[PDB]
Write an enzyme that holds these catalytic residues in place. Structure first.
Site, PDB file in Angstrom:
ATOM      1  N   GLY A  18       0.790  -1.228   0.000  1.00  0.00           N
ATOM      2  CA  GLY A  18       0.000   0.000   0.000  1.00  0.00           C
ATOM      3  C   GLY A  18       0.825   1.282   0.000  1.00  0.00           C
ATOM      4  O   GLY A  18       2.064   1.253  -0.055  1.00  0.00           O
ATOM      5  N   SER A  19       0.116   2.410   0.056  1.00  0.00           N
ATOM      6  CA  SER A  19       0.741   3.745   0.069  1.00  0.00           C
ATOM      7  C   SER A  19       0.026   4.723   1.020  1.00  0.00           C
ATOM      8  O   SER A  19      -1.188   4.963   0.889  1.00  0.00           O
ATOM      9  CB  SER A  19       0.745   4.342  -1.339  1.00  0.00           C
ATOM     10  N   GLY A  20       0.781   5.267   1.980  1.00  0.00           N
ATOM     11  CA  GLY A  20       0.361   6.445   2.753  1.00  0.00           C
ATOM     12  C   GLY A  20       0.730   7.730   2.014  1.00  0.00           C
ATOM     13  O   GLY A  20       1.217   7.681   0.870  1.00  0.00           O
ATOM     14  N   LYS A  39       6.458  -0.427   7.133  1.00  0.00           N
ATOM     15  CA  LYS A  39       5.933   0.915   6.896  1.00  0.00           C
ATOM     16  C   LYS A  39       7.111   1.891   6.781  1.00  0.00           C
ATOM     17  O   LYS A  39       7.956   1.990   7.674  1.00  0.00           O
ATOM     18  CB  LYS A  39       5.010   1.313   8.056  1.00  0.00           C
ATOM     19  N   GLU A  77       3.838  -7.089  12.037  1.00  0.00           N
ATOM     20  CA  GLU A  77       3.098  -8.250  11.625  1.00  0.00           C
ATOM     21  C   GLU A  77       2.321  -7.901  10.362  1.00  0.00           C
ATOM     22  O   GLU A  77       1.792  -6.798  10.229  1.00  0.00           O
ATOM     23  CB  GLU A  77       2.143  -8.734  12.771  1.00  0.00           C
ATOM     24  N   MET A  79      -0.739  -7.914   7.845  1.00  0.00           N
ATOM     25  CA  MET A  79      -2.170  -7.883   8.038  1.00  0.00           C
ATOM     26  C   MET A  79      -2.719  -7.988   6.647  1.00  0.00           C
ATOM     27  O   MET A  79      -2.973  -6.991   5.998  1.00  0.00           O
ATOM     28  CB  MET A  79      -2.616  -6.585   8.721  1.00  0.00           C
ATOM     29  N   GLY A  82      -5.573  -6.126   4.764  1.00  0.00           N
ATOM     30  CA  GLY A  82      -5.431  -4.726   4.380  1.00  0.00           C
ATOM     31  C   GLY A  82      -6.243  -3.794   5.257  1.00  0.00           C
ATOM     32  O   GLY A  82      -6.620  -4.153   6.361  1.00  0.00           O
ATOM     33  N   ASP A 122      -6.754   9.778  15.643  1.00  0.00           N
ATOM     34  CA  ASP A 122      -6.852   9.697  14.190  1.00  0.00           C
ATOM     35  C   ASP A 122      -7.507   8.385  13.810  1.00  0.00           C
ATOM     36  O   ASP A 122      -7.062   7.721  12.900  1.00  0.00           O
ATOM     37  CB  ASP A 122      -5.446   9.814  13.572  1.00  0.00           C
ATOM     38  N   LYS A 124      -9.766   6.108  11.971  1.00  0.00           N
ATOM     39  CA  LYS A 124     -10.492   6.124  10.689  1.00  0.00           C
ATOM     40  C   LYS A 124     -10.279   4.805   9.971  1.00  0.00           C
ATOM     41  O   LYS A 124      -9.370   4.042  10.322  1.00  0.00           O
ATOM     42  CB  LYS A 124     -10.066   7.303   9.806  1.00  0.00           C
ATOM     43  N   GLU A 126      -8.880   3.940   7.388  1.00  0.00           N
ATOM     44  CA  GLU A 126      -7.522   3.757   6.878  1.00  0.00           C
ATOM     45  C   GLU A 126      -6.568   3.156   7.933  1.00  0.00           C
ATOM     46  O   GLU A 126      -5.567   2.497   7.570  1.00  0.00           O
ATOM     47  CB  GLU A 126      -6.937   5.085   6.401  1.00  0.00           C
ATOM     48  N   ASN A 127      -6.898   3.368   9.212  1.00  0.00           N
ATOM     49  CA  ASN A 127      -6.027   2.986  10.334  1.00  0.00           C
ATOM     50  C   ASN A 127      -6.552   1.777  11.096  1.00  0.00           C
ATOM     51  O   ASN A 127      -6.143   1.509  12.218  1.00  0.00           O
ATOM     52  CB  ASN A 127      -5.828   4.195  11.264  1.00  0.00           C
ATOM     53  N   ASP A 143      -1.291   3.303  13.299  1.00  0.00           N
ATOM     54  CA  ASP A 143      -0.969   4.725  13.130  1.00  0.00           C
ATOM     55  C   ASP A 143      -1.210   5.576  14.365  1.00  0.00           C
ATOM     56  O   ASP A 143      -2.261   6.224  14.503  1.00  0.00           O
ATOM     57  CB  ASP A 143      -1.711   5.329  11.972  1.00  0.00           C
ATOM     58  N   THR A 162      -3.533  28.996  45.039  1.00  0.00           N
ATOM     59  CA  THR A 162      -4.640  29.947  45.210  1.00  0.00           C
ATOM     60  C   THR A 162      -4.705  30.828  43.952  1.00  0.00           C
ATOM     61  O   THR A 162      -3.659  31.278  43.458  1.00  0.00           O
ATOM     62  CB  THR A 162      -4.418  30.804  46.447  1.00  0.00           C
TER      63      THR A 162
END
Ligand SMILES: C/C(=N\NC(=N)N)c1ccc(NC(=O)c2cc3cccc([N+](=O)[O-])c3[nH]2)cc1
Ligand SMILES: C/C(=N\NC(=N)N)c1ccc(NC(=O)c2cc3cccc([N+](=O)[O-])c3[nH]2)cc1
Ligand SMILES: [Mg+2]
Ligand SMILES: [Mg+2]
Lengths: 285, 285
Positions: A18-20, A39, A77, A79, A82, A122, A124, A126-127, A143, A162
């Site tokens: 994949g691509s970030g 990553k 690891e 995944m 995806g 974050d 979502k 994607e994560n 992420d 105080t």
């Protein structure tokens, strides 16, 4: 460019998975000949690493290795399923059962974060990573680039003295302090909404209300025909997570106690998936 | 205990000048035989030190040396006048002229902080030092233990993307973000109030309203007989600094442009005091 020597020493690098904004490569660990994901982050990554090294939960990604070179390389690891993103994109939607299995695991993960004083910030699709290409699988949150570690605040230190010289806005902030974790519960709400319906609650598609006004008013886009097929219990939870007041919003504990998640078959599938993942040493008795 | 060897190597330690919660000693630098003050802090001091090493203003204390041992030792210029606290304690009060001289310098100091992205956060008479026992003297702000360095916020990073998954409370915080420096202007307001009147604006003395309610309502204790002798211009500035809304509150620039500080004699005394402090090298022409 080339991969750093220390990485090459331990791993053979292969195809792109994949691509970030960012990239994920397949690699093989030389010692074991087993597949890993790597990553790459182009140049607080090292403290994201330290956070993830100390967390131990089956629904949170584990770091196997780390190389700080021309770029950062994070080994984890594989995944193979995806990103969750790819399961919900293009108005695709998961069976309500699959939503519940995935969401339960997201809640367990985020609950564990918040218990350990960590906010993700974050969350979502994607994560969220899927362990396999089977529908019934384990998920892991990834992420931690925006994460934050809770601890003693400046506020708490201020309140010890105080307030002779202290500004009213600091005193006013006391009412709402310590609810920053609720931002994760909102996001989870948005994720669940998307999973169940195949479309986002808040978006500029075919509307004149600004995204910001949609969000701050809490007025999500409800299309009944899309939702007709979804249970009332599922939508009820969605509504308790997409609560604009962060102090009223469901916590992860409240969500986990919700009727929708009181589902013994779902919880069996999850436990079965866990034991399947595991490769245990012999035990006494 | 004993003083650390590296401190003893360079300095002869003498009498106590004061006590924090903390202690300040007179010392003599061996090389020059000149007096210095040494602040002892029993075990983010090192980053307070880094902040103060990079600041260069005549109204902000300078660090001459630092020793990180059993305790922290911070060496600075002697400020023989001591704390402003001692000039205002027991309802003592300074002439309005002396208030203006001191306050002008506090504004210059704090203005310089805010220009340089630093908020002090603990401005009070205890943290204002006087250079001499003369009434007309230079003042320096000290104690950066609560200070904070402004820079790119999480908020700013969040606003770069699309808020599909973002919580309404984050969007709501945008209206008020970036005014944290205003807490210093409030404190200055409280300091000025105390200097001019010899009593605190907000206190639990002979009142049934809680200190917190006094502060958040902005309802200071006005005793006209004490104030009769103070100018209207002085009190006007006080009122523009003790403004509950941080976005409406006077900034240091607004305060410095206030009629009360348009005082050419005051500004002459200050410039005279500066040149007097200074021991200059010869200059071309
Ligand atoms: C820690 C982290 N990012 N941190 C950050 N950006 N600051 C991080 C972000 C994303 C991942 N993604 C993956 O591991 C990941 C994405 C993906 C897509 C198809 C297939 C696979 N796979 O492993 O088979 C994938 N793995 C892994 C780590
Ligand atoms: C940096 C700092 N504190 N930081 C912190 N507590 N975290 C700090 C705090 C206080 C001081 N105070 C003095 O230097 C100081 C107090 C005092 C009282 C009578 C007389 C003198 N004097 O120098 O003659 C005094 N100097 C100096 C430094
Ligand atoms: Mg991210
Ligand atoms: Mg202090």
């Amino acid at each position: 460019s080339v991969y750093p020597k220390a990485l090459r020493d331990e791993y053979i690098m292969s195809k792109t998975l994949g691509s970030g904004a960012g990239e994920v490569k397949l690699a093989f660990e030389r010692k074991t000949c087993k597949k890993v994901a790597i990553k790459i982050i182009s140049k607080n990554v090292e403290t994201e690493i330290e956070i993830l090294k100390k967390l131990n939960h089956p629904c949170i990604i584990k770091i196997k290795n780390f190389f700080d070179a021309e770029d950062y390389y994070i080994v984890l690891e594989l995944m193979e399923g995806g990103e969750l993103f790819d399961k919900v994109v293009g108005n695709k939607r998961l069976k309500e059962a699959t939503c519940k299995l995935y969401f339960y695991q997201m809640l367990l993960a985020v609950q564990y974060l918040h218990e350990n004083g960590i906010i993700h910030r974050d969350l979502k699709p994607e994560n969220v990573l899927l362990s396999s290409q089977e529908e019934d699988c384990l998920i892991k949150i990834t992420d931690f680039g925006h994460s934050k570690i809770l601890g003693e605040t400046s506020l708490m230190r201020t309140l010890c003295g105080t307030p002779t010289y202290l500004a009213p806005e600091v005193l006013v902030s006391v009412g709402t302090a310590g609810y920053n974790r609720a931002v994760d519960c909102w996001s989870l709400g948005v994720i669940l909404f998307i999973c169940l319906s195949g479309y986002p609650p808040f978006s500029e598609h075919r509307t004149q209300v600004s995204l910001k006004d949609q969000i701050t008013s809490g007025k999500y886009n409800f299309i009944p025909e899309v939702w007709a097929e979804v249970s009332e219990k599922a939508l009820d939870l969605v509504k308790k997570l997409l609560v604009v007041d962060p102090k009223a919003r469901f916590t992860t504990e409240e969500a986990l106690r919700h009727p929708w998640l009181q589902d013994e078959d779902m919880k069996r599938k999850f436990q079965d998936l866990l034991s399947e993942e595991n490769e245990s040493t012999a035990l006494p008795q």
